[PDB]
């Protein structure tokens, strides 16, 4: 029962319940003293039972007693139980000290064991450590002086902070924490600004993307906690998924696009057919604007095989490859075949590179290789100049003819329903198949048009080449995108479902490049709203299931 | 007040090492119960355990 | 109750207690 | 038949 | 508190009677520094200061009790305390205690 | 073209002529509240209805009554601005005229002895600002409309989720506006049951017994009768030809299949039947023999073999029975009668009294009034007019248009219709249909709460009149205004639908005033909502926007009014449509609701029209019953009025919306409401043409009430001399617009009005004189135009990250002004009175440098974190200082003071400029010096407008005096008019000075309040959230140096580098089109800039402008030859920074027009340029998409999201750290974090986070001491929450303990 502000008081409902019980017990004693009639004594005993029941467990014996706010009172049981009870809100999940929270950005210069911590958060979280060091080196005589220097933001406080942080791991967390990779230990690098810089390769573990997500920062204090963070919780030790064993640090997006563009083959490029002494020579050739990055060359590759028994066999042969694969061979550690690089590298190929590096080399080589893959992919995705434009969505010329033929055949089945040859359900299931085959044929035509091109070789002949379209490269590299999204981009959006689950007979024959009219957009919203609502309910149900399983 | 829901005799002193009547109002008088007020001179935290 | 969990780094500790409860 | 003390007293 | 049913007034009320850990550390440091400073005085002078200000003892004392514990009177004890306070008012043995204010 | 539009004409890319202008965006609020407050002679709406529903008040005995006459609303004490300044509610007093009359007991009733009539005050009604907002407790609030179930009868079913059988249980449910619910359900054994107030089920026949229905009458109403006769010793049917269509047919040759149509062409009135055909049938009447005196066969009783013989012996020859099938007719009512246990009205009344009041002894008279109160009493049951119309439409009743209570025929027809639905005829009603859902606005809610308060006062008035002692009582003694005021204050301050006004930008204004919520009182629940209500029903076309609904738990439960949606007289949403006659399409339009929409076919604006005004295609696209299809041209009935009819205002501002996925469009619409105004407002290069409507209707701009010429312009005042055609006689002739300058919004954002006018130019009505926040020349301007390159840059735009140049940071394009409130309240305590003074103990002089003599900082002081703003000292009690502390005091002196320093300090990491200080003093307290200075400052500021008005009036009067110079008469008249003007000015200034000098009604216990406004210029930094208008949000990852960013051949670097990877997967292609069109627009802008620079002749400028405005086959006909030379120069000047282009939603610019404008701007047709790397100088080997995009700075800043804590304040009971940045709390280590550490194996980290960091009281102090000492070791203890749990379990009488 405490004074909030300016004479206003805040109490607990237990006070009201206990007051009722005491008042009615006193009334019962007074009635017994006065030798009251039996009916009044009986009613008093009845209310005593009711009040004690409301105190122990309100809303169970009868109607819940409500306070002056027209809300039910909270009893002992109601606060030892429930989601907002003692157990789940204060004994299993606790608010903690030495904690912070900030928006997360991307640090492409960081390493796996490093995270970018703002100096303000580091100063506020590591304050007792700063005080300790200031006293032990004698810059501050007592704790008050140390606080004065820390608050004044003196110069030496920053050196003290960079000595405390030097080898002190910090735990980064993101809500929700679906699995154990949602909390990881990093070595802090102190940065200006107010945002935490996160290594890209760990984002997939956090399910974190930089559109405004925030992360929590925890500072372990005791030596045992620091050893646990450095030995068990380090991001370097956490590179395999505990669910399946597959690597979780596989590159995505920009890295995959860069490594894919670097490992592609172009026909009749500048510097084709040259002979190169090795990866360094290929790098020299591309930096000198002699051979294009997609030029076919013959490169002398030295290659070490590490057998299962530990045999390290070195060999050197001349391999037909491109300049880009020759360069990428520089960062591949010894003990791996060149056949792992001598191909266009999508997401699956890079995942296989990391998997085999872990299998035949261990963890340190794997983490160094993952870092180098990330830097090379970022650099060459930057140098590539991949850009999405409006001429990149090549709508096939067969789409209009197919739509016209589908309309003609739908009208033919429309003048055949009156003949009684078919039923309404048969007409429905036939128009649906007509349009659901027109969709497949339009998608196939678009993919055939978009994934091929015709180039001129050195001889002068016309030769088919895999296309270098931006959207096609995005989809084929596996970076971000798929065939269905391209078919909704440049083909046909397709048949859609009514809010009940039924399928509208007339599909959306227009794509996003040429735009939709009002009805098509309404039909699209019909499914968008379902998707969002089902995502929300799915999150709730999955959380409940995970809690029961744990 | 006395014998209420917040009584200082039953549950303990409100202020640290003091008493309601102020007769014993320092640490030197620990463990001594006032005759005037009946409040044992101790810490306030005992009110979360009594 | 706020004590070490019988898993991970806190496993061996509990084992010793069990040993101390065996004797 | 009823669980309200008020009606019982009535 | 808000439109949500998860936030209550009871979570926004702070315990004001609690002592800050910084204050506890400052108190311990002050005790240690006072012990170090009193270690630089004469045994009788340190004893009279400690007994008349109740340091490391279970009670405080007037000059009657300090006079009776020794073989010494009122004014004698009063001026030993005066001499101690002039000794500790000297700048040489006061820089440490200045930071505690 | 208007003057404010002729300055900067936006090129329109639309092709469809506009027929209906977008109406006032805030009509939904203004019309509702005007209906609430305005006088109603017929008394169906407004406070008149509320007064007439309760008054007159009848006493129990009938001695006297209180009657109502009329009402009025007085002059407000304050206006809106100072109501916000002091923190009081803007309201008008309600003054109602009532008459008290007394009736004598001896004399017959209705004899008037004496009447006492007067005007009594019954509370204060909050008024609505012209912009549709309320000022409650000094804060601006919006009442949000509610979408609720319409009153009436709703027929639905179970769909088969009750029992595993394929049977579907059907039911009906009546919802009154005020009353108790009534349900009629089917059980899974073909019986119909009744449910009153959701209680336990009862046979339906009970509700008929209680209504005076004998079993014969029940069978008559609920069944058809087939009759039998005994003719010539033969059994005899009747003739109903439709019934037969098989033992035989006794119509001779008409016999059949021992199809009926064969000989049904010929009719005979006789059919004979066996005795066996009757055995399985049930009776219909009661048959009594007078001789026997008993009841042989009862109604609804199965007829037996001996029954026929006994009836024949009784002499009865006519036998009518019921009619039962297995498909079309059913025994439901008969079986329900067979399962009922009552036999008479009173027994059924006893049964329903026992059910309604379980355990109560059966009382008859109570029963009567209970049933009469349940449904048939006007006091407890009220079916509104809308509910009455829904009822009369559902069951087909055609009368009782004013009745509001159920009667016999209502329940009879509800039962009949539900049985008809069970038979097969008819269909259930769609629960999500917008004809079944209603819009309830401010007026209706205020009426309801006012009526609740009126009932509260009615009870006491009735009791007091029932006392009877009525000799000297005037009516202002029974009326208690406080309960009514409490009710209205409760509604306007603590309702879930009364929310703080989202004031980031004008779009937030409009979207908050046009929001519709399914939550609130009488609404839905977030956890109890279902899929069906959240889904998009087809009736939402033109009524609710299918795009903008918040992401998350509130998905679908909160909607936005569409652009042209309207509320009819009944509260149902309606949308406009152009009618078609004789195949031609007419300008004039009709508003249709959801019920009226189903019948007609409705085309849409995309349908092509001929020059004759008719459809071109024979098969045009249209809708019927919510299904789209192709329909004949001559069948059309209506067409849509505009292309943006289905989308709301926020989604109508997204260019190229038809090229975006619905998800990303929804994200963009929601995210465009979170934009923060910047220092300089810049128009969108690519827009939709809706910006002017939003800017004008938001109210943030200063709109000219009358035309004329601006007499004077200033940053704070605009004075307009009105033209002599709009001058009301006797008026001064000038209008004064005072502009808001640097006023804090609800979201701590600057509200500033900037003049956009010169002295002397002409202005018309509706013209913009000042631009408010996020407005540029009358156009909505949220973000800024940024040069955009779509290309990956070294991982600094990984995922949705954004790479930003230093040029835009240096140019302050995204800098914002935030105004923050800090309050210091000096109260009165037990020890003494808290004082605001500069004599702060233990504080030096440097900290008092910015403080004045009173103890308040000056205006314009640059303050940083920790600086004192208001110096306040608090009396404190005695401190029992520790022994070493008294050593320190003895050695160093420094005696303690009687006051402690509790002063208002600037929060950490906050540094700004003090821009205003307000001091509020309780009456009777000495006003400090600063309060006096502020008082004189406000008086000096306030006398200026009155001084100017008096000066112009006196100048006109003296000019009249000179012109006049019979003579003495005119001189005396002029002198007396001058005296009258002087007296009026004196009265106005007296009222003003009284307002400023007036004391403040502060809360009890407080003596002084000091309020400081801090202005902070927040620059754009990494971690800030930036977004476009297509759902493409992002967080800035780096502020790149200029020399490191990509640049073009001419050397122009880009401003923002965006990742292309997010475009294909997310299906937001409108952004690429916007980039291309913005590139073209800025190209044309720089061409005009060049033409201006070398001072080319106006002929070439006119030719180029005409060429630009004539591009494409559009609906815009701009004639540059019709503009003056100066007007053309102003247009060219305003087009220097780019040509604004309008691309309406679903009527946008095709790719051909974009490429044509790119060609006109001498830019690549593909929109892709050759960029060069700044770091290396090498050109990128693929062309890169470069252009201009409208970027927004969202109100998600890293400045107010960064938070850190080591040790702070702790909670009172749990002894755990607080939660929140404002409270300096700690992060929550929930269940899943504990699971993650358990999975890792971190026992020690888990133990530390559980005990030391959270609630081990001794542990955390010991750990802090150890860390300061440098030990990094812990001695963990018992968590405090577990001890709380043990005590709580012990309080339940359960012995829980710890063993050793
Ligand atoms: Mg995100
Ligand atoms: Zn005492």
Q: What is the DSSP string of C1-23?
A: --S--SSGGGHHHHHHHHHHHH-
3-state secondary structure of A425: helix
D2 contacts in chain F (CB < 8 Å): 358-360
Q: Do F880 and B25 touch (CB under 8 A)?
A: yes
Closest CA relative to residue F819, chosen from F908, F915, F907: F915
Q: Would the annotation count A476 as a binding residue?
A: no
Q: Do B16 and E17 touch (CB under 8 A)?
A: yes
- How far is Cα F1013 from Cα F743, in angstroms, rounded to an integer? 9
Q: What is the DSSP letter of F1194?
A: B
Query: For F832, left (φ over 0), alpha (ψ -120 to 50), or beta?
Result: left
Q: Would the annotation count B37 as a binding residue?
A: yes
Cβ pairs bridging D and F (under 8 Å) = 11
3-state secondary structure of F1114: coil
The C-alpha of A255 sits at a distance from chain E's nearest C-alpha, in angstroms, of: 43
Cβ pairs bridging A and C (under 8 Å) = 4
List strands edge to edge, sheet with F202-203: F152-157, F170-175, F182-187, F191-196, F202-203
Residue F1066: other Cβ atoms inside 10 A: 21
E8 and chain F in contact, CB less than 8 A: no
Closest residue in chain F to residue E31, using alpha carbons only = F884
- How far is Cα F144 from Cα F1072, in angstroms, rounded to an integer? 36
What's the distance, CA F992 to chain centroid? 36
B33 C-alpha to ligand 2 centroid (Å): 7
Closest CA relative to residue A333, chosen from A360, A313, A308: A360
3-state secondary structure of A134: helix
- How far is Cα F1015 from Cα F911, in angstroms, rounded to an integer? 8
Q: Are F668 and F1070 in contact (CB under 8 A)?
A: no
Closest CA relative to residue F492, chosen from F446, F441, F447, F443: F446
Closest CA relative to residue F920, chosen from F75, F139, F82: F82
**Number of H helices and number of E strands within chain A?**
20, 14
- How far is Cα F155 from Cα F436, in angstroms, rounded to an integer? 11
The C-alpha of B35 sits at a distance from chain F's nearest C-alpha, in angstroms, of: 22
Chain D: residues touching F (Cβ < 8 Å)? 1-2, 4, 7-8, 10
b/e for F281-297, b at 16 or more Cβ within 10 A? bbbbbebeeeeeeeebb
Q: Would the annotation count B21 as a binding residue?
A: yes
The C-alpha of F744 sits at a distance from chain A's nearest C-alpha, in angstroms, of: 25
Residue F1024, phi then psi, degrees to nearest 5: -70, 150
The alpha carbon dihedral of A382, A386, A390, A391 has a sign of positive
Q: Which two tokens stand for residue F592?
A: 């249709």
E59 contacts in chain B (CB < 8 Å): 28
> What residue spans of chain B are helical by DSSP H?
8-11
Closest CA relative to residue F1072, chosen from A393, A528, A446, A380: A393
How far is CA F474 from each of CA A406, F54, F62, F453, F470, rounded to the nearest angstrom?
85, 20, 18, 21, 9
Q: Are F115 and F99 in contact (CB under 8 A)?
A: yes
Closest CA relative to residue F87, chosen from F141, F136, F143: F136
- How far is Cα A95 from Cα A170, in angstroms, rounded to an integer? 17
Q: Are B28 and E60 in contact (CB under 8 A)?
A: yes
Q: Do E96 and A12 touch (CB under 8 A)?
A: no
Residues sharing a CB contact under 8 Å with residue A38, sequence separation 6 or more, in sequence order: none
- Provide long-range contacts, Cβ within 8 A and 24+ apart, for A75-80: A75/A13, A75/A14, A75/A17, A76/A14, A76/F1288, A76/F1291, A76/F1292, A77/F1292, A79/F1288, A80/F1285, A80/F1288, A80/F1289, A80/F1292
- How far is Cα C22 from Cα F1155, in angstroms, rounded to an integer? 87
Q: Which of A43, A47, A62 sits opposite D3 (nearest CB)?
A: A62
Q: Which two tokens stand for residue A117?
A: 């911590």
Q: Are F340 and F206 in contact (CB under 8 A)?
A: yes
Residues sharing a CB contact under 8 Å with residue A115, sequence separation 6 or more, in sequence order: A107, A170, A172, A186, A187, A188, A189, A196, A197, A198, A199
Q: Are F262 and F281 in contact (CB under 8 A)?
A: no
F799 C-alpha to ligand 1 centroid (Å): 9
Mutation pick from A45, A62, A64 vs chain D, by most beta carbons of D within 10 Å, is: A62
Residue written as token pair 């009165």? F828
HEC per residue, F194-258 = EEECCCCCEECCHHHHCCCCCHHHHHHHHCCEEEEEEECCEEECCCCHHHHCCCCCCCHHHCCCC
Residue written as token pair 């279970």? E58
Q: Are F94 and F121 in contact (CB under 8 A)?
A: yes
D5 contacts in chain A (CB < 8 Å): 43, 46-47, 50
- How far is Cα F357 from Cα D7, in angstroms, rounded to an integer? 9
Q: Are F263 and F315 in contact (CB under 8 A)?
A: no
- How far is Cα F969 from Cα E5, in angstroms, rounded to an integer? 77
Q: Which of A101, A499, A529 sits opposite F1227 (nearest CB)?
A: A101
b/e for F877-901, b at 16 or more Cβ within 10 A? eeeeebbbbebbebbeeeeeeebbe
Omega of the bond leading into F56 within 30 degrees of 0 (cis): yes
- How far is Cα A279 from Cα A302, in angstroms, rounded to an integer? 10
All partners of chain B with 3 or more CB pairs under 8 angstroms? A, E, F
3-state secondary structure of A311: coil
**Number of H helices and number of E strands within chain B?**
1, 0
* End-to-end C-alpha distance for chain F, whole angstroms: 92
- How far is Cα E52 from Cα E44, in angstroms, rounded to an integer? 12
B42 C-alpha to ligand 2 centroid (Å): 11
Q: Do B49 and F1287 touch (CB under 8 A)?
A: yes
Stated resolution in angstroms:
3.1
How far is CA F8 from each of CA F11, F653, F691, F901, F1147, rounded to the nearest angstrom?
9, 18, 13, 58, 22
Q: Which two tokens stand for residue A450?
A: 């978009």
Q: What is the DSSP letter of F21?
A: -
Q: What is the DSSP letter of F1051?
A: -
- Exp. method: cryo-EM
Closest CA relative to residue F1039, chosen from F816, F813, F802: F802
Q: Are E26 and E32 in contact (CB under 8 A)?
A: no
Bridge-based pairing of strands F686-687 and F1141-1142 is parallel
B43 C-alpha to ligand 2 centroid (Å): 14
Query: For F1215, left (φ over 0), alpha (ψ -120 to 50), or beta?
Result: left
Q: Are F1110 and F1119 in contact (CB under 8 A)?
A: no
- How far is Cα F871 from Cα F838, in angstroms, rounded to an integer? 5
Q: Do B25 and F1283 touch (CB under 8 A)?
A: no
F212 and chain D in contact, CB less than 8 A: no
Chains F and B touch (3+ CB pairs under 8 A): yes
Determine the angle formed by the axes of helices A38-56 and A13-34, rounding to 10 degrees. 160
Residues sharing a CB contact under 8 Å with residue B42, sequence separation 6 or more, in sequence order: B12, B13, B17, B30, B31
Residue F870, phi then psi, degrees to nearest 5: -125, 120
Residue written as token pair 């998860």? E6
Closest CA relative to residue F619, chosen from A459, A506, A1, A127: A506
Residues sharing a CB contact under 8 Å with residue E62, sequence separation 6 or more, in sequence order: E52
Task: Report helix, strand and coil shares of chain A as percent, to nearest 5.
Answer: 50, 15, 35
- How far is Cα F751 from Cα F769, in angstroms, rounded to an integer? 16
- How far is Cα F764 from Cα F7, in angstroms, rounded to an integer? 14
3-state secondary structure of B16: coil
How far is CA F333 from each of CA F204, F295, F318, F419, rounded to the nearest angstrom?
8, 23, 24, 9
Residue F1084, phi then psi, degrees to nearest 5: -65, -40
Cα angle A214, A220, A226 (rounded to 5 degrees) comes to 125
Q: Which two tokens stand for residue A322?
A: 């491109």
Q: Do D5 and A63 touch (CB under 8 A)?
A: no
For residue A215, which ligand has an atom nearest its CA? 1
A25 contacts in chain B (CB < 8 Å): none
For residue A174, which ligand has an atom nearest its CA? 1
Task: Provide the residue count of chain C.
Answer: 23
Closest CA relative to residue F917, chosen from F1029, F1006, F836: F836
Q: Which helix (H) or strand (E) holds F750?
A: strand F750-751
> What residue spans of F614-755 are helical by DSSP H?
662-671, 691-698
Query: For A156, left (φ over 0), alpha (ψ -120 to 50), or beta?
Result: alpha
Residues sharing a CB contact under 8 Å with residue F189, sequence separation 6 or more, in sequence order: none
Q: Which of F1184, F1241, F1250 sits opposite A387 (nearest CB)?
A: F1184
Q: Do E21 and F1211 touch (CB under 8 A)?
A: no
Q: Which two tokens stand for residue A239?
A: 């590179």
Residue F509: other Cβ atoms inside 10 A: 29
Q: Are F505 and F774 in contact (CB under 8 A)?
A: yes
The alpha carbon dihedral of F765, F766, F768, F773 has a sign of positive
Residue F864: other Cβ atoms inside 10 A: 11
Determine the angle formed by the axes of helices F1070-1093 and F1098-1109, rounding to 10 degrees. 170
- How far is Cα F1230 from Cα A91, in angstroms, rounded to an integer? 10
Q: Do F358 and D8 touch (CB under 8 A)?
A: no
Residues sharing a CB contact under 8 Å with residue F631, sequence separation 6 or more, in sequence order: F601, F619, F620, F621, F622, F624
DSSP-assigned states of every residue in A385-404 = T----SSSS---THHHHHHH
Q: Do F1204 and A93 touch (CB under 8 A)?
A: no
Q: Are A102 and F1025 in contact (CB under 8 A)?
A: no
């Amino acid at each position: 029962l405490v004074p909030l502000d300016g004479g206003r008081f805040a109490t607990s409902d237990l006070n009201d319940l206990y007051r009722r019980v005491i008042n009615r017990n006193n009334r019962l004693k007074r009635l017994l003293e006065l030798a009251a009639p039996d009916i009044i004594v009986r009613n008093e005993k009845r209310m005593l039972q009711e009040s004690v029941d409301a105190l122990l467990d309100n809303g169970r014996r009868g109607r819940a007693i409500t306070g002056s706010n027209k809300r039910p009172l909270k009893s002992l049981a109601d606060m030892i139980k429930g989601k907002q009870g003692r157990f789940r809100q204060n004994l299993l999940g606790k608010r903690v000290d030495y904690s912070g929270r900030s928006v997360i950005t991307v640090g492409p210069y960081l390493r796996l064991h490093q995270c970018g911590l703002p100096k303000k958060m580091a100063l506020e979280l590591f304050k007792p450590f700063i005080y300790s060091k200031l006293e032990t080196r004698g810059l501050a005589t007592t704790i008050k002086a140390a606080k004065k220097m820390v608050e004044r933001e003196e110069a030496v406080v920053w050196d003290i902070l960079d000595e405390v942080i030097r080898e002190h791991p910090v735990l980064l967390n993101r809500a929700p924490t679906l699995h154990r990779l949602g909390i990881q230990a990093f070595e802090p690098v102190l940065i200006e600004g107010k945002a935490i810089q996160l290594h890209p390769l760990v984002c997939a573990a956090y399910n974190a993307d930089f559109d405004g997500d925030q992360m929590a920062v925890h500072v372990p204090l005791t030596l045992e906690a620091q050893l646990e963070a450095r030995t068990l919780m380090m991001s370097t030790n956490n590179i395999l998924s505990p669910a399946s064993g597959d690597p979780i640090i596989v590159p995505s997006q920009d890295v995959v696009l860069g490594l894919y563009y670097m490992t592609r083959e172009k026909i009749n490029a500048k510097g084709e057919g040259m002979y190169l002494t090795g990866p360094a020579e290929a790098e020299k050739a591309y930096r000198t604007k002699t051979a294009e990055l997609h030029a076919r060359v013959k490169v002398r590759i030295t290659e070490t095989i590490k057998h299962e028994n530990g045999k390290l066999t070195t060999e050197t042969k001349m391999i037909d490859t491109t300049v880009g694969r020759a360069m990428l061979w520089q960062i591949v550690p010894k003990g791996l075949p060149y056949s792992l690089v001598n191909q266009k590298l999508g997401k699956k190929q890079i995942s296989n590179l990391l998997n085999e590096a872990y299998r035949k080399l261990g963890l340190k080589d794997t983490v160094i290789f993952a870092d180098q893959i990330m830097y090379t992919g970022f650099a060459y995705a930057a140098l590539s100049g991949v850009s999405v434009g409006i001429d990149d969505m090549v709508v096939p010329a067969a789409k209009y003819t197919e739509i016209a033929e589908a309309e003609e055949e739908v009208r033919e089945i429309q003048e055949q329903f009156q003949s009684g040859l078919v039923t309404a359900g048969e007409r429905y299931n036939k128009v649906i198949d007509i349009w659901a085959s027109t969709n497949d044929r339009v998608a196939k035509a678009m993919m055939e048009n978009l994934s091929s091109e015709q180039v001129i070789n050195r001889q002068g002949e016309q030769e088919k080449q895999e296309s270098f379209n931006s959207i096609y490269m995005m989809a084929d590299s596996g970076a971000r995108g798929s065939a269905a999204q391209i078919r909704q981009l440049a083909g046909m959006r397709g048949l859609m479902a009514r809010p009940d689950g039924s399928i509208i007979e007339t599909p959306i024959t227009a794509n996003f490049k040429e735009g939709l009219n009002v009805l098509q957009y309404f039909i699209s919203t019909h499914g968008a709203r379902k998707g969002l609502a089902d995502t929300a309910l799915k999150t709730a149900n999955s959380g409940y299931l995970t809690r029961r399983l744990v | 007040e006395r014998d209420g829901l917040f009584c200082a005799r039953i549950f303990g002193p409100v202020k640290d090492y003091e008493c309601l009547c102020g007769k014993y109002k320092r640490l030197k008088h620990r463990g001594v119960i006032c005759e005037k007020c009946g409040v044992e001179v101790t810490q306030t935290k005992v009110r979360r355990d009594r | 109750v706020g004590r070490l969990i019988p898993a991970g780094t806190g496993f061996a500790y509990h084992q010793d207690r069990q040993a101390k409860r065996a004797q | 038949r009823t669980t309200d003390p008020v009606r019982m007293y009535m | 508190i808000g439109d949500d049913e998860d936030s209550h007034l009871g979570d926004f009320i702070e315990d004001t009677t609690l002592e800050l850990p910084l204050d506890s550390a400052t108190a311990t440091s002050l005790k240690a520094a006072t012990r170090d400073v009193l270690a630089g005085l004469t045994p009788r002078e340190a004893k009279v200061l400690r007994m008349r200000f109740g340091i490391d003892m279970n009670t405080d004392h007037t000059l009657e009790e300090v006079g009776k514990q020794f073989d010494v009177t009122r004014e004698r004890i009063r001026q030993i305390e005066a001499k101690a306070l002039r000794k500790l008012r000297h700048p040489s043995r006061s820089e440490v205690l200045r930071s505690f204010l | 073209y208007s003057y404010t539009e002729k300055k900067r004409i936006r090129k329109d890319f639309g092709t469809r002529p506009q027929v209906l202008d977008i109406p006032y965006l805030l009509s939904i609020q203004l019309d509702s509240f005007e209906k609430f407050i305005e006088q109603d002679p017929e008394g169906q709406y407004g406070l008149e209805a509320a007064f007439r529903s309760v008054f007159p008040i009848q006493s129990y005995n009938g001695n006297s009554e209180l009657q109502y006459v009329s009402y009025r609303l007085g002059e407000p004490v304050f206006d809106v601005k100072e109501c916000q300044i002091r923190g009081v509610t803007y309201s008008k007093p309600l003054r109602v005229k009532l008459r008290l009359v007394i009736f004598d007991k001896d004399a017959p009733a209705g004899t008037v002895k004496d009447i006492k009539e007067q005007e009594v005050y019954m509370g204060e009604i909050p008024l609505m600002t012209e912009n549709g907002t309320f000022v409650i407790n000094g804060t601006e609030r919006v009442i949000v409309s509610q979408l609720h179930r319409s009153p009436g009868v709703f027929f639905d079913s179970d769909k088969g989720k009750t029992h595993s059988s394929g049977k579907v249980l059907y039911n009906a449910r009546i919802i009154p506006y005020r009353g108790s619910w009534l349900d009629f359900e089917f059980d899974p054994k073909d019986n119909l049951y009744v449910r009153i107030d959701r209680r336990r089920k009862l046979p339906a026949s009970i509700i008929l017994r209680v209504l005076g229905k004998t079993s014969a009458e029940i069978l008559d109403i609920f069944f058809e009768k087939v009759n039998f006769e005994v003719k010539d010793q033969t059994l005899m049917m009747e003739l109903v030809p439709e019934r037969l269509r098989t033992f035989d047919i006794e119509a001779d040759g008409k016999v059949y299949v021992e199809h009926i149509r064969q000989l049904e062409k010929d009719g005979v009135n006789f059919i004979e039947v066996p005795v066996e055909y009757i055995v399985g049938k049930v009776s219909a009447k009661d048959y009594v023999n007078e001789a026997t005196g008993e009841l042989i066969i009862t109604a609804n009783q199965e007829i037996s073999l001996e029954a026929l013989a006994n009836l024949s012996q009784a002499g009865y020859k006519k036998l009518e029975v019921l009619f039962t099938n297995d498909l079309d007719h059913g025994p439901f009512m008969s079986e329900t009668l067979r399962v009922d246990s009552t036999t008479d009205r009173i027994s059924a009344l006893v049964e329903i009294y026992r059910m309604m009041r379980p355990g109560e002894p059966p009382t008859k008279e109570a029963a009567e009034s209970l049933f009469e109160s349940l449904f048939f009493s006007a006091e407890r049951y009220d079916l509104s007019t809308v509910g009455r119309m829904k009822f009369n439409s559902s069951i087909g009743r055609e009368d009782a248009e004013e009745q509001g209570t159920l009667d016999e025929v209502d329940i009879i027809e509800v039962m009949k219709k539900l049985i008809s639905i069970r038979n097969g005829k008819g269909e259930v009603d769609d629960i999500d249909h917008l004809g079944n859902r209603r819009i309830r606005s401010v007026g209706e809610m205020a009426e309801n709460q006012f009526r609740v308060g009126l009932v509260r006062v009615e009870r006491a008035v009735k009791e007091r009149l029932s006392l009877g002692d009525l000799d000297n009582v005037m009516p202002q003694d029974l009326i208690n205004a406080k309960p009514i005021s409490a009710a209205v204050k409760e509604f306007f301050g603590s309702s879930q639908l009364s929310q703080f006004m989202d004031q980031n930008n004008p779009l937030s204004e409009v979207t908050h005033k046009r929001r519709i919520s399914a939550l609130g009182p009488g609404g839905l629940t977030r956890e109890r909502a279902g899929f069906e209500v959240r889904d998009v029903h087809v009736t939402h076309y033109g009524r609710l926007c299918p795009i903008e609904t918040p992401e998350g738990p509130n998905i679908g439960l909160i909607n936005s009014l569409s652009a042209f949606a309207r509320c009819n007289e009944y509260g149902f949403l309606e949308t406009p449509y152009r009618r078609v006659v004789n195949g031609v399409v007419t300008d004039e339009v009709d508003y249709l609701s959801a019920i009226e929409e189903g019948q007609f076919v409705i085309a849409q604006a995309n349908a092509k029209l001929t020059e004759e005004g008719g459809f071109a295609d024979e098969l045009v696209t249209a809708r019927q019953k919510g299904e789209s299809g192709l329909h004949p041209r001559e069948h059309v009935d209506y067409m849509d009025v505009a292309t943006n009819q289905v989308v709301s205002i926020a989604a109508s501002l997204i260019p190229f919306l038809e090229h975006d996925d619905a998800n990303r469009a929804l994200m963009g619409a929601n995210m465009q409401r979170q934009a923060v105004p910047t220092l300089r407002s810049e128009k969108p290069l690519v827009g939709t043409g809706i910006e002017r409507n939003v800017a004008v209707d938001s109210g943030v701009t200063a709109v000219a009430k009358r035309g004329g010429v601006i007499q004077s312009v200033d940053a704070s005042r605009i004075v307009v001399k009105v033209n002599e055609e709009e001058l009301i006689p006797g008026e001064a002739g000038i209008d004064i617009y005072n502009l808001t300058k640097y006023t804090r919004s609800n979201q701590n954002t600057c509200i500033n009005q900037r003049p956009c006018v010169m002295p002397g130019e002409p202005v018309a009505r509706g013209d913009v004189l000042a631009d408010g926040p996020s407005t540029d020349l009358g156009e909505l301007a949220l973000g800024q135009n940024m040069r955009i390159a779509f290309m990956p840059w070294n991982g600094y735009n990984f995922e949705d990250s954004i790479l930003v140049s230093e040029r835009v940071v240096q140019d302050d394009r995204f800098t914002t002004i935030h105004i923050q409130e800090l309050s210091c309240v000096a109260r009165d305590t037990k020890l003494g009175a808290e004082e605001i003074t500069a004599d702060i103990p233990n504080v030096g002089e440097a900290a008092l440098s910015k403080l004045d003599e009173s103890g308040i900082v000056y205006i314009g002081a640059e303050v940083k974190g920790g600086d004192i703003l208001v110096g306040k000292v608090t009396p404190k009690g005695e401190t029992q200082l520790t022994p070493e502390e008294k050593l320190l005091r003895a050695i160093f002196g420094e005696k303690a003071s009687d006051v402690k320093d509790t002063s208002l300090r600037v929060p950490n990491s906050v540094a700004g400029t003090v821009i205003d200080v307000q001091v509020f003093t309780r009456d009777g307290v000495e006003k400090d010096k600063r309060a006096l200075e502020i008082e004189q400052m406000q008086l000096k500021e306030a006398k200026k407008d009155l001084t100017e008005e008096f000066q112009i009036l006196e100048g006109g009067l003296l000019a009249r005096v000179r012109s006049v110079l019979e003579l003495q008469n005119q001189l005396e008249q002029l002198a007396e008019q001058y005296d009258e003007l002087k007296a009026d000015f004196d009265k106005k200034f007296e009222a003003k000075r009284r307002k400023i000098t007036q004391g403040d009604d502060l809360a009890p216990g407080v003596l002084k309040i000091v309020k400081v406004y801090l202005a902070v210029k927040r620059r754009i930094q990494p971690g800030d959230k930036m977004a476009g208008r297509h759902g493409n949000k992002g967080v800035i990852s780096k502020i790149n140096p200029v020399e490191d960013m990509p640049y073009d051949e001419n050397g122009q670097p880009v401003d923002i580098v965006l990742n292309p990877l997010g475009v294909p997967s997310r299906m937001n292609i409108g952004q690429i089109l916007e980039v291309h069109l913005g590139l073209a627009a800025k190209g044309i802008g720089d061409k005009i800039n060049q033409m201006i620079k070398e001072q080319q002749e106006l002929a070439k400028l006119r030719e180029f402008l005409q060429k630009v405005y004539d591009l494409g086959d559009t609906r815009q006909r701009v004639d540059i030859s019709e503009l003056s030379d100066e007007d053309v120069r102003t247009l060219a000047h305003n087009l220097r920074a780019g040509l604004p282009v309008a691309t309406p939603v679903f009527d946008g610019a095709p790719e051909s027009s974009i490429k044509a404008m790119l060609e006109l701007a001498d830019l690549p047709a593909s929109g892709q340029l050759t960029l060069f790397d700044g770091r290396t100088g090498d050109a990128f080997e693929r062309p890169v998409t470069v252009g201009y995009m409208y970027m927004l700075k969202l109100n998600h800043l890293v400045d107010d999201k960064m938070h850190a804590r080591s040790t702070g304040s702790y909670s009172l009971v749990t002894q755990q750290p607080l939660g929140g940045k404002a409270q300096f709390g700690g992060q929550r280590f929930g269940e899943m974090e504990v699971w993650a550490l358990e999975a890792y194996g971190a026992a020690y980290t888990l133990q530390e986070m559980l005990t030391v960091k959270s609630d081990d009281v001794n542990g955390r102090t010991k750990m802090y001491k150890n860390i300061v000492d440098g030990n990094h070791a812990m001695e963990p203890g018992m968590p405090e929450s577990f001890n709380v749990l043990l005590k709580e379990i012990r309080s339940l009488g359960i012995n829980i303990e710890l063993e050793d």
